[PDB]
Design a protein around this ligand. Structure first.
Ligand SMILES: [Cl-]
Ligand SMILES: [Cl-]
Lengths: 184, 184
């Protein structure tokens, strides 16, 4: 209908992550509960359409042209499933999104009907890169996936960024990542 | 409640795939509509619990111990989302599943709120490896993802199996596949 402040998921899930199990180094110490001065770590809401969500996302990959209807349809579907955790950092002093990252829960029949996590669409605004938000997002979502009882969590990255993800307990798999982009 | 014959998705979706766009070689010619004598290519149903679904799946990876309640809960969630296409081949002369493969539709905000495909949990029974079922499953699901308007489709595989997936238009990505299995 109209963009609003309704969160995609329960915001308490981020704060109730067992932060003692974080393995990334934070200087100064920040947490999901206290991400830094003037900042809030929270689920995406549809009103964020007008808070520079696509400006941040567009720094990572093309977002093309998006209508409010397109965005809200997509958001509502992600919300309904209960399996999408699109997470943002808002600078409340600006009223603008400065970082985002997504956790997706995928359901399986293998490993006794296991769940597995996927980390996607991670980007911190280029003007906001000294606030440790990338580490905060990855650690929080990785810990959240463990809280949600995932058997494993995976992601893809270019070689130069392997070192970053190793900080959260990820290792390079033996498996190759293969892709087909539909040109027709 | 009780295992039954209800399909996870509309079975016509597999048959209405544009089979002329297949790029894998089939000798003899088989299709989603006519997969081979005594065979049916169809969505998973809960009754397949008693048709060797986990026997086939267990050849790929550990399935551990699974209850009927666990299986049906997992199945019903996958069905409700509309984004899970767990597909099987049943030998109707035996009443047994002989192959399976999964297409998952993941929803994004990037690329004008795009959808992207994921191929997972592909396995053909070890006693049934001369019936071209692997190629049939991969081509059908790859074409189905295109029909469902996915921007791209991805999967992971070990190096020795790259050649197989190249038959359906997949190429090795520049990105590394990274993983964390939760030991705690
Ligand atoms: Cl898993
Ligand atoms: Cl995509």
């Amino acid at each position: 209908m109209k963009p609003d402040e309704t969160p995609m998921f329960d915001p308490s899930l981020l704060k109730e992550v067992d932060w003692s199990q974080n393995t990334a180094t934070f200087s100064p110490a920040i947490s999901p509960t206290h991400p830094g001065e003037g900042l809030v770590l929270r689920p995406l809401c549809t009103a964020d359409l007008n808070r520079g969500f696509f400006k941040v996302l567009g720094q990572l990959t093309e977002t093309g042209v998006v209508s409010p209807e397109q965005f809200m349809k997509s958001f509502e579907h992600m919300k309904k499933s209960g399996d999408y955790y699109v997470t943002v950092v808002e600078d409340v002093t600006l009223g603008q999104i400065v970082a985002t990252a997504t956790l997706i829960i995928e359901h399986k029949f293998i490993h006794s009907c296991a769940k597995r996590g996927r980390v996607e669409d991670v980007v911190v605004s280029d003007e906001c890169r000294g606030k440790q938000l990338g580490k905060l997002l990855l650690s929080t979502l990785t810990l959240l996936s463990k809280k949600l009882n995932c058997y494993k969590i995976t992601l893809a990255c270019l070689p130069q960024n392997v070192g970053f993800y190793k900080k959260f307990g990820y290792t390079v798999s033996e498996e190759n990542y293969m892709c087909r982009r539909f040109l027709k």
